């Protein structure tokens, strides 16, 4: 490809899907870089936690 | 009067308005004449309609029709020859003199002199979209009906405005489903799911500065008349300007 | 070559000289597109006329 000084060029990358019966996407969510910490209440609804896990 | 007739002129915005007067010798004199002929043992008349042409103006010129006119002579028929007429630039309605002649060769080969030539007024009886905010007008230099396969194609758009602020418009194609009776409930969705899935704009958010060559490729095939996803917008006083023009067959 | 949106690229074109004993560069100077006209005095020195003829 070539991009000169402002000219955008939308790359069209083909991939496949993922299979929901092959990966579990409800596993421990947003894993911390370091184990431990305060362990405070999440303060969010369980359903919200589901969509935050999927969107990560 | 035997051959009942009507004058149909159809108006198109490709600078054309065609004329095809329809003629049909209807039942009103037929119910009497084809029982006099049934008493004279005839039920297949033949009035030899072979001589007919139109007139345009005071220069009474036979305009060349798009269809042909051979020796037409049979029983109970009806004919409507189509003639190309040039569309006027305004309401200058050219009154016309419809001329025709049928030599009524009756039973026992009896010819009768008749014609249908009279005059009337030939009134029809009735690319660009303008802005909403500025003096800007949008047209497509390339022709709005075009052929392509599923591959790449070049598309070119006119922007002509007033040069008081001649700048700062943006495009975007907005490939997402408009989220919207049950068969209409799955008809509006299947309209929107082929608007937002068919073509993709390979340079969206194109800053304009007149001329710009907008860059699409289409995925799935059909007739994308008024391809309506793409939206330019004025960055001051944001109004959702739409260009609902153009078409693309993909076969 | 390639010039993107502002990037100058100095083309280095090689030529030869000219020979002063092959062309005469003191011929009728600054020839007019159309013959005739007023025919006014040049109002310039003859030496200046020489260097104007060469520089054209």
UniProtKB/Swiss-Prot annotation, chains A, C:
Disulfide bonds: none
Location of this chain's protein in the cell: Golgi apparatus, cis-Golgi network
Coiled coil: none
Family to which the UniProt record says this protein belongs: Belongs to the TRS120 family.
Function: Specific subunit of the TRAPP II complex, a highly conserved vesicle tethering complex that functions in the late Golgi as a guanine nucleotide exchanger (GEF) for the Golgi YPT1 GTPase. TRS120 plays a role in the YPT GEF activity of TRAPP II in concert with the two other TRAPP II-specific subunits TRS65 and TRS130.
Subunit structure: Part of the multisubunit TRAPP (transport protein particle) II complex composed of BET3, BET5, TRS20, TRS23, TRS31, TRS33, TRS65, TRS120 and TRS130. Interacts directly with TRS65.
Additional observations: Present with 259 molecules/cell in log phase SD medium.
Name this protein carries in UniProt: Trafficking protein particle complex II-specific subunit 120
Gene (UniProt): TRS120
Segment of the intact protein contained: 1066 to 1121 of 1289
Swiss-Prot record, chain B:
Subcellular location: Cytoplasm; Golgi apparatus, cis-Golgi network
Subunit structure: Part of the multisubunit TRAPP (transport protein particle) II complex composed of BET3, BET5, TRS20, TRS23, TRS31, TRS33, TRS65, TRS120 and TRS130. Interacts directly with TRS120 and TRS130.
Note: Present with 1660 molecules/cell in log phase SD medium.
Protein function: Specific subunit of the TRAPP II complex, a highly conserved vesicle tethering complex that functions in the late Golgi as a guanine nucleotide exchanger (GEF) for the Golgi YPT1 GTPase. TRS65 plays a role in the YPT GEF activity of TRAPP II in concert with the two other TRAPP II-specific subunits TRS120 and TRS130. Involved in cell wall (1-->6)-beta-glucan synthesis.
Listed name of the protein: Trafficking protein particle complex II-specific subunit 65
Species in which this protein is naturally found: Saccharomyces cerevisiae (strain ATCC 204508 / S288c)
Name of the encoding gene: TRS65
